[PDB]
Enzyme design. Structure first.
Site, short mmCIF file in Angstrom:
data_model
loop_
_atom_site.label_atom_id
_atom_site.label_comp_id
_atom_site.label_asym_id
_atom_site.label_seq_id
_atom_site.Cartn_x
_atom_site.Cartn_y
_atom_site.Cartn_z
N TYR A 1 4.76 8.75 5.85
CA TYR A 1 4.89 7.63 4.93
C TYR A 1 5.56 8.09 3.66
O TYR A 1 5.07 9.04 3.02
CB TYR A 1 3.54 7.16 4.48
N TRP B 1 3.52 -5.24 8.11
CA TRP B 1 2.38 -6.09 7.92
C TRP B 1 2.93 -7.17 7.01
O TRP B 1 3.94 -6.98 6.30
CB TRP B 1 1.12 -5.15 7.60
N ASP C 1 0.82 -1.18 0.00
CA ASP C 1 0.00 0.00 0.00
C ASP C 1 0.88 1.27 0.00
O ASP C 1 1.60 1.55 0.96
CB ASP C 1 -0.96 0.00 1.17
N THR D 1 7.28 1.78 0.50
CA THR D 1 7.24 0.46 1.14
C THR D 1 8.17 -0.49 0.41
O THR D 1 8.21 -0.51 -0.84
CB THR D 1 5.81 -0.12 1.17
N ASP E 1 7.86 0.03 5.99
CA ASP E 1 7.74 1.38 5.49
C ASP E 1 9.03 2.12 5.71
O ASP E 1 9.78 1.86 6.69
CB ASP E 1 6.59 2.08 6.20
N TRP F 1 2.85 1.64 8.85
CA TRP F 1 3.80 0.74 9.53
C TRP F 1 5.15 1.38 9.73
O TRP F 1 6.14 0.87 9.23
CB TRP F 1 4.02 -0.56 8.83
#
Ligand code: HEC
Ligand code: HEC
Ligand code: HEC
Ligand code: HEC
Ligand SMILES: [Ca+2]
Ligand SMILES: [Ca+2]
Ligand code: NA
Ligand code: NA
Lengths: 125, 354, 376, 125, 376, 355
Positions: free
Chosen positions: A113, A51, A26, A116, A70, A102
């Site tokens: 963020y 995750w 994501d 990822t 992340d 995360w």
């Protein structure tokens, strides 16, 4: 291009949203802003929280556990945006939930963020 | 062959004749019935072991020998972290260098010297024959060669499939032969997504071929002293166990208070826990990790004492980046972790779970 | 033929096949070099903005840097650091304003300095590169202020501290020529030389008026600090060249970027960074297109390339995209960078043949400013 | 739509970038985010500074001086973005220059650019 | 047919012709009413974000509010104020984090409170409307904290002060039922009731586990504070309705959104705000399309409208666009708002007939959350 | 009629017989050769004017009567701003309300009462003829009617094109008959893009038909006391000129120190400047606005004295929002504003522009 169709993994382009490891990614692929598949871009901070997802590898027919981490402390990259949700469960199953930022464990308490990464952490199941 | 060598170490391993009073063998402390740990209660509970003399206690918990053969030889990697070796402080390079030390350690088997170890090896006709067939005639007449050949036979014995059978439920699940229970699978998932897998996995990424739930690195997780174990060892209340810094050659003060990441295999059946036995319960061992993450009153408390954990024995070089994960393990996750860890018990020790 | 995301796919599969381990970590950007190019994104006046650090040879984003409201990027020519003057507010775009300068390590991209500017003194304007400027030794950053009056603020990067505001005439832009000297362009058609101490009234000297009241000099002149060449187009592609390398202004002969017939047919420059200057080649590149006389900020599809000494046209490239800004690498066989604010893409051309080589897309919202370091 | 073509004013839609009064606007039309042709959106602050232009009103054949004022202290609206430069001169003729954030004099020292208004201040001469 | 831009051109033409004067000023937004709609743009994790305040009827933007990183917007049902829990950093996306609450006057849009939240306590996550919630009296804001464990933050909007954190079990989302009470959804599949007196551990009751391990409930349930109706779709479209009007959780008959037939042809809910609930009509609206089982966050082209009481399907709408989020005004003859993250457009439909009336395009970068006040 | 009422005011305007000692007419202080201002020197220079007794000085500068006929009657608009009227504090509603006041003011023309004014108007046979044909027989015999009628005739006269010919260069340039010099065009642009236009243009937006460079509002720009004028007027060291607050009926303390925005028409030839004639040069009146904007020391110093401008006479209700524009006028822009302002000079006074 048909976003509702079953997602079809490929093992040939990491910058594309259908790369097999991005199965529950994501945000943005780190490889698109100076990171790589499994490393953060310069200036960002790697979270220790993740995750996970078991992502099918078309290539060896094996399923791998991908623990998304992340890279934090930057504004979202804006490049190679992707959202997949293979096996993604709601927030109350956080270990598999991917709306969550995360960033926990990140240096300097970085929590914004940027992108990822998609490391393998073991064999699925 | 490696058969015969291992067969000779198997004799030596259970032989109390390699202790001063001939009261104890490697198996007395590394009891194969207890995942190669010490069942015997002492002046300090099961936290430390009693030597051949009937009164001397160690200041460290006796570790399992299971899977110790998978640990690399001691070394510093290119990102500057020491990895591998034997003993909780990595003071031995490998199994070979480790094997002979118990034999000559006064608080353990307490043979005076190598010559006495050789003399004992000469009293048994079966040793003359086993040794000589493997290392040549008169091996037992030279103490150095005898002692070294003994340590080699011990090391080989510990490298047999018997010490590292990978027949745990975790192994069987990863072979596709069976499934984890929901709770075990939660525990596995929690284990690999929480800070645990930053130290208790072989690799940083990719899949390990023979997982032993340790990256072989050295971390100071900030444990306090085991006050009775420390009392029983008679090392003094002044004494600080500096873990790795105690290995000769290691000078770097960043390593003070750091210990080798134990392999979590059989962890369910080798309490008490940590380098000093301080925690009798596995659940305590896990809860100890909440002290760096949980803001709740109870995380500062050791549930076995009812009191604060105690200051770290060594209050620097704490692995804070790894331990301050920002996330606290709730009861549910701690339960699920216990379940997961239990699946790392070898088939032959499944009865020991209960 | 094989893309970087394909190469990376292939190398990951091979690492997985061989069981090769690798620790996840924060990468370092490759050493700054001649083909590194920074693209700043003023994001059409958004309160926060992004710069993209790009490897022009691979066409790969090697890094990013966050900024605030309309920051002024600078890049030390020698590759040692980059910096910007930037503006944040305590509540996104409201509340207490803090103007500050950050200096960054060019490999880790970590800020090595964060210098408050007192009294929020930055000029908030659509990004003109020459409104914030490094002295050649890299020790001082100079920033224009417009309000309450034109002024130039002095920031000591080495001692990491704001020094003072300088009062200047009615003039604009800052072309440093020395650790203590810069030029501005004045409303009355002159240049002003400003020589400043740590204290005291700056020494201010005007050149003569070098252009008529009715010849309009664009907001994005190219200035090569290492050559002291100031290349100043007018609305008509008339090019003013001022040589500041003696430390005073020597007016060079005017060239026309466009021919009389082209001008008769409505050829005019247009865009943002309409002009680039290759130091080593002594070449001027001007974004031109056929356009009405007041469409001077629209994109252009052609770059003309002309010898800076003769005004001779060497090439006229059809860029094949809507280009707003150009710049060039300062090495041999330069790249000609062509940034489309509309496409949010940096097209990377071979500056000799004008061929499009590769491109870097997805560069923010309205990227406008291309900066390269002159390293050689 | 040919961006390089001579700009052709219309006096029939103020949200379009060819509305006659926007002949030197730079940014966003306040009418598109809660202001109006000549008023600021709620929560933003009205600048007292302005740059001017002489814009031809095709309704009456007369040219008018439009002094554009910015509404400030919000992030850019992102709606009805426009840039026109009729008679727009470089920054050194700042009264006719439109890259400048004309937020001066705005209440609370607001200097962030949200959008721009297009009031008439006089006839052209 | 006349657009708002055109009608505005004519009024201005007429004012100019009549020689009518008017003072340039700051407009007030029209009084908040049932057709006011708020679109929040989490901007795909960008560090600063926007809220659009929209007149539903006119399809016009009447104002905007800036927010920080993934802010949580709330709207007082009575229209008397709006508020968000937001997050800024001292250097765009890096440095000291400040979490805070602002309360805004709903017509001047000016902040009336700015309440600092100690210790950066906000859960940072893709926007779930029910992660930050107003109590029915509007005097208290409750925000979710995930780190280091599930918790709920208590903010006194009346005295404009943070109060304390509430310890809770492994639970998620915040559904206030009263001045001192809110429900959460727990990992063990119960709801927890949290009652917070003034001091010490809140009193926590659990309900019956109301779904198995493998029935997945969406991150964006609809919750009507004034109904006490919690509406919770699962991945399959199975909809849990929970009644909280009495103070304790009464479970309503579970109902299905798609047919057993339909589920076999791959009809599944999918999107962001997948479900709307009209209070007065006791009616459920669900975004559905034919999709794989793990494409549950993708846009949908169809809305199904079902009777909350019986489960009868009242309509199927072909939205004509890729919709990610829906909501409805809570008046009679309600509008059905259909937000496309992709198009950045609020399509405003007549909720009765699904007809598209009007739309408001250009709503940020990736708008996601539609909030409406429930006023009567 | 409209011709004749004006023509009668014309006579009154220039008639000293309306002052106690018969030394002074409206024209004495509102002199047609100087844009209807006072050329005479008093004890405060040209700051304030001397009345009929040859001794008494006023506390305010005599303003032009040019374009005063364009000012709306005094009122409060819906945005609660007062607007219009006559006198610096707008205490008279309009020209007719204002006209009688100089007459009975002991500091000015100093007639003791309406009756004494009526008696004067009877001694002149042409006023009997003139006033009786406009207002009826025996109008001069009624002191109230006579005084109202003089005020009316005087108001009518000031509304003739003669007082407001709109024939300045600015008017000629706006009608297309000529162009501004480059300096005037720059002045013009500054004027309409800087904070001046917020007060010295009739309308907030759009175009005025008869621009007179004032919005007729009341603003306290924070002027200091004019010490010599204030000493000449004898009002005392502790006196405060409250501006609009002094209008009977205005109680609002936010109006203290606010004065009516003057028309800048003929500004060039009607120095000194401001309500107390405190500044001699046009340039100084312009530089005053920089004290709110400039960061430089010199911005706080009155160039005409070299001393600080001074504490505001009234230090509250300053138009800070308008005055604190955040931008300083440089000398180029000041020169340009002077040039522009000189274009506002009526045609017949272009000769005075020489100085
Ligand atoms: C009780 C008195 C013991 C006897 C007899 C033996 N060992 Fe042991 N062993 C004991 C302790 C308390 C420790 C840890 C001490 C420390 O300094 O850390 C050990 C350690 C080992 C190890 C290292 C295992 C690891 O680091 O993970 C090995 C390989 C080992 N011991 C083997 C061994 C052999 C071969 C013995 C007979 C010669 C033997 N031990 C005797 C306790 C006792
Ligand atoms: C590196 C920073 C670590 C992290 C993160 C975790 N563990 Fe650990 N563990 C670590 C060391 C260096 C040691 C030995 C500590 C000592 O000084 O004695 C341990 C020990 C355990 C044990 C005891 C096992 C035994 O004594 O044989 C258990 C059960 C354990 N660790 C589990 C565990 C879990 C479940 C974790 C995630 C919550 C975890 N550890 C984190 C190093 C590190
Ligand atoms: C000098 C003694 C004067 C004589 C004789 C007259 N006037 Fe006057 N006038 C004078 C001053 C000092 C002022 C301002 C005083 C104040 O309180 O503000 C005025 C004002 C006017 C005005 C108002 C103009 C404006 O507000 O812009 C008008 C219309 C006016 N005066 C007209 C007038 C007439 C008609 C006179 C004879 C009947 C007359 N004045 C005499 C100074 C003196
Ligand atoms: C309202 C806030 C104003 C702004 C902005 C400007 N001016 Fe002004 N001006 C104003 C008032 C209320 C007055 C009279 C003040 C008093 O008490 O006397 C004035 C006066 C002038 C004058 C003198 C005119 C005369 O005495 O006849 C000049 C020359 C003048 N003003 C010019 C001017 C310029 C050039 C401005 C922009 C810099 C400007 N004013 C702004 C009200 C306001
Ligand atoms: Ca143990
Ligand atoms: Ca005067
Ligand atoms: Na103990
Ligand atoms: Na009064």
């Amino acid at each position: 291009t048909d976003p509702r169709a079953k997602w079809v993994p490929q093992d040939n382009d990491i910058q594309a949203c259908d790369y097999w490891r991005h199965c529950s990614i994501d945000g943005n692929i780190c490889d698109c802003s100076g990171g790589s598949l499994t490393n953060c871009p310069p200036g960002t901070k790697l979270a220790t929280a993740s995750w996970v997802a078991s992502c099918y590898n078309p290539t060896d027919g094996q399923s791998y556990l991908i623990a998304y981490r992340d890279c934090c402390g930057y504004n979202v990259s804006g490049r190679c945006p992707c959202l997949n949700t293979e096996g993604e469960l709601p927030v109350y199953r956080p270990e598999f939930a991917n709306d969550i930022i995360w960033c926990f464990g990140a240096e300097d308490d970085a929590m914004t963020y940027h992108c990822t990464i998609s490391p393998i952490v073991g064999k699925a199941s | 062959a490696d058969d015969a060598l291992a067969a000779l170490g198997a004799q030596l391993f259970v032989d109390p004749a390699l202790s001063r009073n001939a009261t104890q063998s490697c198996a007395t402390c590394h009891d194969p019935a207890r995942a190669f740990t010490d069942p015997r209660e002492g002046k300090a509970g099961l936290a430390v072991s009693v030597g051949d003399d009937g009164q001397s206690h160690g200041d460290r918990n006796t570790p399992t020998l299971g899977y110790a053969a998978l640990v690399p030889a001691f070394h510093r990697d290119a990102n500057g972290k020491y990895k591998g070796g034997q003993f909780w402080d990595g003071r031995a390079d490998d199994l070979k260098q480790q094997a002979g030390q118990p034999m000559l350690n006064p608080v353990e088997m307490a043979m005076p010297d190598r010559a006495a170890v050789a003399a004992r090896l000469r009293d048994d006709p079966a040793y003359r024959t086993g040794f000589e067939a493997l290392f040549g005639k008169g091996v037992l007449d030279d103490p150095e060669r005898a002692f070294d050949a003994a340590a080699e036979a011990l090391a080989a014995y510990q490298a047999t499939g018997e010490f590292s059978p990978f027949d745990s439920k975790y192994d069987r699940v990863m072979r596709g032969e069976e499934k984890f229970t929901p709770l075990e699978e939660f525990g596995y998932t929690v284990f690999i997504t929480w800070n645990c897998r930053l130290c208790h996995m072989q690799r940083k990424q990719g899949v390990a071929e023979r997982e032993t739930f340790t990256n072989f690195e050295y971390h100071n997780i900030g444990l306090p002293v085991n006050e009775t174990a420390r009392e029983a060892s008679g090392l003094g209340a002044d004494h600080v166990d500096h873990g790795l810094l105690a290995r000769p050659g290691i000078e770097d003060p960043a390593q003070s208070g750091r210990f080798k990441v134990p392999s979590l295999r059989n962890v369910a059946v080798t309490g008490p826990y940590m380098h000093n036995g301080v925690f009798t319960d596995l659940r305590t061992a896990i809860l100890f990790y909440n002290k760096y993450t949980s803001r709740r009153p109870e995380a500062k408390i050791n549930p076995e004492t009812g009191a604060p954990w105690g200051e770290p024995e060594v209050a620097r070089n704490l692995s804070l980046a790894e331990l301050q994960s920002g996330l606290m393990l709730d009861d549910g996750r701690v339960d699920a972790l216990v379940a997961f860890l239990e699946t790392l018990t070898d088939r032959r020790y499944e009865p020991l779970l209960e | 033929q094989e893309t970087q995301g394909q190469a990376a796919a292939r190398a990951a599969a091979a690492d997985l096949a061989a069981g090769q381990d690798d620790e996840p970590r924060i990468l370092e950007a490759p050493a700054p070099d001649a083909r590194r190019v920074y693209v700043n994104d003023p994001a059409h006046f958004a309160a926060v903005t992004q710069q993209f650090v790009i490897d022009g040879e691979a066409g790969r984003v090697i890094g990013m840097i966050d900024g605030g409201f309309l920051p002024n990027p600078v890049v030390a020519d020698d590759g040692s650091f980059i910096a910007h003057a930037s503006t944040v507010f305590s509540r996104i775009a409201r509340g207490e304003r803090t103007d500050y300068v950050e200096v960054f390590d060019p490999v880790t991209l970590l800020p090595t300095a964060d210098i408050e500017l007192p009294d929020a003194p930055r000029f908030l304007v659509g990004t003109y590169p020459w409104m914030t400027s490094l002295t050649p030794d890299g020790k001082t950053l100079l920033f224009y202020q417009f309000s309450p009056a034109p002024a130039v603020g002095v920031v000591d990067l080495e001692g990491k501290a704001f020094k003072r505001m300088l009062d200047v005439p009615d003039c604009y832009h800052i072309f440093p020529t020395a650790p203590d000297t810069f030029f501005m362009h004045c409303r009355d058609g002159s240049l002003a030389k400003v020589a400043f101490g740590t204290e005291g009234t700056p020494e201010i000297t005007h050149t003569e008026v070098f252009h008529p009241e009715d010849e309009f000099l664009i907001n994005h002149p190219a200035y090569s600090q290492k050559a002291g060449r100031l290349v100043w187009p007018t609305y008509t592609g008339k090019i003013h060249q001022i040589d500041l390398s003696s430390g005073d202004a020597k007016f060079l002969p005017a060239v026309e970027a466009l021919t009389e017939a082209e001008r008769a047919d409505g050829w005019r420059p247009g865009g943002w960074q309409q002009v680039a200057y290759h130091r080593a080649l002594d070449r001027i590149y001007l974004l031109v297109d056929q356009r009405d006389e007041w469409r001077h900020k629209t994109a252009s599809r052609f770059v003309v390339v002309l010898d800076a000494k003769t005004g001779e046209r060497l090439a006229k490239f059809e860029m094949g995209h809507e280009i707003d800004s150009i710049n060039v690498s300062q090495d041999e066989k330069p790249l000609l960078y062509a940034l489309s604010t509309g496409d949010k893409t940096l097209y990377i051309h071979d500056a000799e043949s004008g061929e499009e080589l590769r491109s870097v897309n997805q560069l923010g919202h309205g990227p406008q400013v291309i900066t390269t370091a002159d390293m050689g």
